[PDB]
Ligand binder design. Structure first.
Ligand SMILES: *[C@@H]1O[C@H](CO)[C@@H](O)[C@H](O)[C@H]1NC(C)=O
Ligand SMILES: *[C@@H]1O[C@H](CO)[C@@H](O)[C@H](O)[C@H]1NC(C)=O
Lengths: 160, 53, 57, 54
């Protein structure tokens, strides 16, 4: 596609806390996260069933990057999402992706036993994006504008 | 005509005319459309290939 | 010969079927172009030697 | 359904994915369904998604 052009969209996440951060991903002095992803957690004592739709009224393809969180303990799972088992479903009119999070203790990286799995979804013009989450959703903040052309990638250590 | 090979395989009502058909070359048109229950075929291209072959 | 985005040709991990195919495609392409390059310069040099011998005659 | 013929058989089947829990239970009763199709060399197990899709 040859571009990282990102357009922020108005997702409304009612009933959850947004912009979660982690000390394994510092930005500045404080904790942070991926700038293009939005870590949603419980608000108060509840994590509702999120149900958001984002139509594509443009003449190009939208690329959506999203993820699901894999906690390491049941205590981490409930204290973040209340529900003992999360679920993330991202669908269009022609596709669906349902991911059940795994709760396992993995080897420590940057002090963390937990993990995040990244997925993607392309929305053709006229189609709509639907996100349905019971918990563990790392939501998108927008879409990347997709292009066709002569761009590519290369592995090299040669100086420019 | 209005039917894709997968629609005629499943038996979309407006593709009933294609039951038990045979072919050397199946020609799919742009105007084709589905008019039955909304469905999804994981690995759609592979099922289309082996039926068409 | 202008090419842009193509396939991966070096791999850091063992994957199996799909990687065997990507390697096989590129190895097939290289052997065929190598043959073309070898045959071309052979036909060309033979003809160049003939045409310069012909001018003298 | 055994294959006692001398040729291969191609079977086309499916799984229904309701949109509500009431649609699920009013059709199949069970709160969560399951479809498993198997031969002696393969097994295909599918759990239906209850989701509201576009
Ligand atoms: C990305 O680019 C657009 C247009 O080039 C620009 O208006 C916008 O500020 C940028 N957005 C982000 C999130 O960087
Ligand atoms: C969830 O979103 C889908 C997609 O628009 C919609 O059909 C469905 O009615 C919504 N469900 C609820 C409970 O809002």
């Amino acid at each position: 596609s040859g571009t990282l052009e990102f357009i922020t969209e108005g997702f409304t996440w009612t009933g959850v806390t947004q912009n979660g951060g982690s000390n394994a991903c510092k930005r500045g002095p404080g904790s942070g996260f991926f700038s293009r992803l939005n870590w949603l957690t419980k608000s108060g004592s509840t994590y509702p069933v999120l149900n958001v739709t984002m139509p594509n009224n443009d003449n190009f393809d939208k690329l959506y990057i999203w993820g699901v969180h894999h906690p390491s303990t049941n205590q981490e799972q409930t204290s973040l999402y209340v529900q003992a088992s999360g679920r993330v479903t991202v669908s269009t009119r022609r596709s669906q992706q349902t991911i059940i999070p795994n709760i396992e203790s993995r080897p420590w990286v940057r002090g963390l036993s937990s993990r995040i799995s990244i997925y993607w979804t392309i929305v053709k013009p006229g189609d709509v994006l639907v996100i349905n989450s019971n918990g563990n959703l790392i939501a998108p903040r927008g879409y990347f504008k997709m292009r066709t052309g002569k761009s590519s990638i290369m592995r090299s250590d040669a100086p420019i | 005509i209005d039917c894709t090979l997968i629609d005629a395989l499943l038996g979309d009502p407006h593709c009933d005319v294609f039951q038990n058909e045979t072919w050397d070359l199946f020609v799919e048109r742009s105007k084709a459309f589905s008019n039955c229950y909304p469905y999804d075929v994981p690995d759609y291209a592979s099922l289309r290939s082996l039926v068409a072959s | 010969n202008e090419k842009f985005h193509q396939i991966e040709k070096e791999f850091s991990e063992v994957e199996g079927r799909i990687q065997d195919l990507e390697k096989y495609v590129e190895d097939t392409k290289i052997d065929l172009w190598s043959y073309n390059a070898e045959l071309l310069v052979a036909l060309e040099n033979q003809h160049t030697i003939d045409l310069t011998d012909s001018e003298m005659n």
